[PDB]
């Protein structure tokens, strides 16, 4: 259970990192 | 009658659009 809990927040970290670094880049590019 | 034959392709087009949106993520991962 602790392994699943310690995996989920790493997945969420990757998700919000990709979304922020994508959206700011398309703000610059557009 | 005919509007049934519209709404069926509406649902099929929704499924096609969702799967075509899902495929591009896997295409990007394969490319990387």
């Amino acid at each position: 259970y602790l392994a699943s809990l310690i995996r989920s927040v790493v997945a969420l970290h990757n998700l919000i990192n990709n979304k922020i670094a994508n959206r700011d880049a398309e703000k610059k590019e557009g | 009658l005919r509007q049934y034959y519209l709404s069926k392709i509406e649902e099929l087009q929704l499924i096609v659009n969702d799967k075509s949106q899902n495929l591009r993520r896997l295409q990007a991962q394969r490319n990387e």
Partner: protein, 472 residues
């Protein structure tokens, strides 16, 4: 002259960018069920309520309406000519005069994005154009000799949904915004039908739109229509609660973590009024913690005022004011005065508290606490005794609860076991009420059952997170 021009800039540009990007996203990609500009509509829950209320009579916002309702846009040259016309329709406010569309030019302006040879391929621009007349009118909060104009614009918005049902509904999914529009308008519209009698025509078309969905589409619209049904179902809540529980409407699922909270609140009150308290407490606590993003938003003041009411009906005693806020400490004062009485056993002081503030208790929508609360006036006490003494006698409980007759003192125990408040058993050879202990919580397969749900939910969070990712 300093107050006009800066709203004229930011409140031109936010919705110009919103409309342009919404049309560009809804047509450029077919996967715009949850676009970026959807969050823009979330901003419209909070922007225009503090942005502008009246049309800003110093020549600022009254000119926004005839420009944004003059939209022809046949192709790229017509849209470019609209971009050229934007400068004149911008400067007409600050230079000469903003046109006085004083609360009446919303009805003949339905054909205004049909005048001057307009084609309507983007239905959401017409949805936002039908959303706009409530900005200087129902968001001004006057409700004085004006009601028929919002009802007319809402019938025009209904005709827009008939257009979404009949005119080119080729996988646009605009209803996923429109139902959200049918959120916000039919909030204050509901307030209009709160002002007058029962909304029977609203009941009929709400049921009709409730079953218009699901088979057509299902994303965050059926939940809003269900909740907008159920609030005024609970207004005249006479026998329809059985209908609401047999209403197979646990469907909702994703609701942006906000609508699901008030849906849980509503079904919690339904289940709380029908004597099932233990199931009501957990969903009440779930609804309280579901969206506590801001302090004292009105919803919290009511769910917190129902929560320990049903907890005191159960028997457990928490203190109320443990979240002292700008509108929690002083708003729950007779609440604290009532919750101080259950720890004691004084019935006369509790009756004096109830009679002193019965008008406020009737204002809270909690008429029927007292019709059960006196039962808990004994019941809580005996559970405290059943928490304190592992093996209590039959005669000591008479003076430990001042219940006079020993048979009367030993009769609440003959109910509290059966519904379930204490594990203890009584035997008629000693007259002694004695309980056991539980050790096997970790010894048996109790933790694995909860752990499987926790593991499944936690690991599925990873899948849902990875499923929305990189878009080069």
């Amino acid at each position: 002259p300093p107050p006009p021009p800066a709203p004229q800039d930011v409140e031109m540009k936010e919705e110009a960018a919103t409309g342009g990007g919404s049309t560009g996203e809804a047509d450029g990609k077919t996967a715009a069920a949850a676009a970026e500009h959807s969050q823009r509509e979330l901003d419209t829950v909070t922007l225009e309520d503090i942005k502008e209320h009246v049309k800003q009579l110093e020549k600022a916002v009254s000119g926004k309406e005839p420009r944004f309702v003059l939209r022809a846009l046949r192709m790229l040259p017509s849209t470019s000519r609209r971009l050229n016309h934007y400068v004149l329709y911008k400067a007409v406010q600050g230079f000469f005069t903003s046109n006085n569309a004083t609360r009446d030019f919303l009805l003949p302006f339905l054909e205004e994005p049909m005048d001057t040879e307009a084609d309507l391929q983007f239905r959401p621009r017409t949805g936002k154009a039908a959303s706009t007349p409530l900005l200087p009118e129902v968001e001004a909060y006057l409700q004085l000799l004006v009601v028929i104009f919002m009802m007319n614009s809402k019938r025009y918005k209904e005709a827009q949904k008939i257009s979404d049902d009949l005119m080119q509904k080729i996988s646009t999914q605009n209803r996923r915004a429109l139902d959200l529009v049918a959120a916000k308008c039919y909030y204050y519209h509901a307030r209009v039908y709160e002002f007058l009698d029962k909304l029977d025509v609203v009941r009929s078309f709400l049921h009709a739109r409730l079953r218009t969905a699901t088979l057509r589409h299902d994303a965050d619209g059926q939940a809003t229509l269900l909740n907008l049904l159920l609030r005024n179902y609970l207004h005249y809540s006479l026998y329809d609660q059985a209908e609401k529980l047999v209403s197979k409407s646990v469907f909702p699922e994703q609701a942006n973590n906000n609508e699901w909270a008030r849906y849980l609140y509503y079904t919690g009150r339904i289940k709380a009024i029908q004597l099932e308290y233990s199931e009501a407490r957990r969903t009440m606590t779930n609804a309280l913690r579901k969206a506590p993003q801001h302090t004292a938003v009105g919803f919290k003041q009511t769910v917190h005022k129902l929560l320990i009411v049903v907890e005191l009906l159960l028997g457990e005693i928490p203190d109320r004011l443990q979240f002292r806020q700008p509108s929690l400490k002083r708003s729950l004062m007779p609440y604290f005065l009532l919750t101080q009485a259950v720890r004691t056993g004084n019935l006369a002081k509790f009756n004096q508290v109830l009679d002193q503030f019965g008008e406020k208790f009737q204002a809270d929508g909690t008429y029927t606490l007292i019709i059960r609360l006196r039962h808990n006036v004994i019941k809580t006490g005996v559970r405290m005794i059943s928490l304190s003494y592992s093996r209590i006698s039959l005669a000591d409980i008479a003076q430990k609860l001042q219940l006079d007759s020993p048979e009367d003192a030993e009769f609440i125990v003959a109910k509290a076991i059966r519904d379930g408040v204490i594990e203890a058993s009584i035997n008629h050879e000693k007259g002694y009420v004695q309980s056991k202990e539980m050790i096997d919580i970790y010894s048996t397969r109790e933790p694995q059952l909860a752990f499987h749900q926790r593991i499944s939910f936690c690991l599925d969070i990873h899948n849902m997170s990875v499923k929305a990712m990189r878009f080069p």
